[PDB]
Paper text:
[name] 1 ([name]) is the primary transporter of all-trans-retinol (atROL) in the eye, and its inhibition has recently been shown to protect mouse retinas from light-induced retinal damage. We determine binding affinities for the newly identified compounds and elucidate mechanisms of their interaction with the protein by solving high-resolution X-ray structures of human [name] in complex with selected inhibitors. Consistent with the fluorescence data, all of the crystallized compounds acted as competitive inhibitors of [name], occupying the same binding site as atROL. Apart from specific hydrogen bonds, effective binding of retinoids or other high-affinity ligands to CRBPs requires interactions with the entry portal region of the protein, comprising α-helix I and II, as well as hairpin turns between β-strands 3–4 and 5–6.
Numbering used by the authors: 2 to 136
The structure:
């Protein structure tokens, strides 16, 4: 499965409640949920870069599949997790070990759609991106 490419947000479902489970204050939840970030992904063997781009903040992930790393979520919920992103078939599975239970996410492709399900303490956000070519 190859996530490389540029992706534009199409839907973002239940993001504010996901952020509330992360204890993001209400004012910042509304700022964040107005945003419609793009994703720019380069998959280079097991080395993956996922850039989440917005006018408010760019959040960059840069990691090796299968290897645990210290993920610095400053500027988001201001926590740090020990994170591992691994192949589960044609799905990319992320586990973020930390203060919060059941924190992680799942990423996969359907057609020209990138699907992202983000989870924490049973709360679930679903996002869908379309593959785009204007860069
Ligand atoms: C909440 C975890 N981040 C990373 C998502 N992700 C999943 C796999 C790789 N990254 C999701 C996300 N952050 C964001 C941004 C963001 C920034 C300030 C807050 C309080 C919330 C969200 C705005 C656009 C980029 C930063 N928008 O969505």
């Amino acid at each position: 499965v190859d996530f490389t490419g540029y992706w534009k947000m199409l839907v973002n479902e239940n993001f504010e409640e996901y952020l509330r489970a992360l204890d993001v204050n209400v004012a910042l939840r509304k700022i964040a949920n107005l945003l419609k970030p793009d994703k720019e992904i380069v998959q280079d063997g097991d080395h993956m870069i996922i850039r989440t781009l917005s006018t408010f903040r760019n959040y960059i992930m840069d990691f090796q599949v299968g290897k645990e790393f210290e993920e610095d979520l400053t500027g988001i919920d201001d926590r740090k997790c020990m994170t591992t992103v691994s192949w589960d078939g044609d799905k990319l599975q992320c586990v973020q070990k930390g203060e919060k239970e059941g924190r992680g996410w799942t990423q996969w492709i359907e057609g020209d759609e990138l699907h992202l399900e983000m989870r924490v303490e049973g709360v679930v956000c679903k996002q869908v991106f379309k593959k785009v070519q204007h860069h």
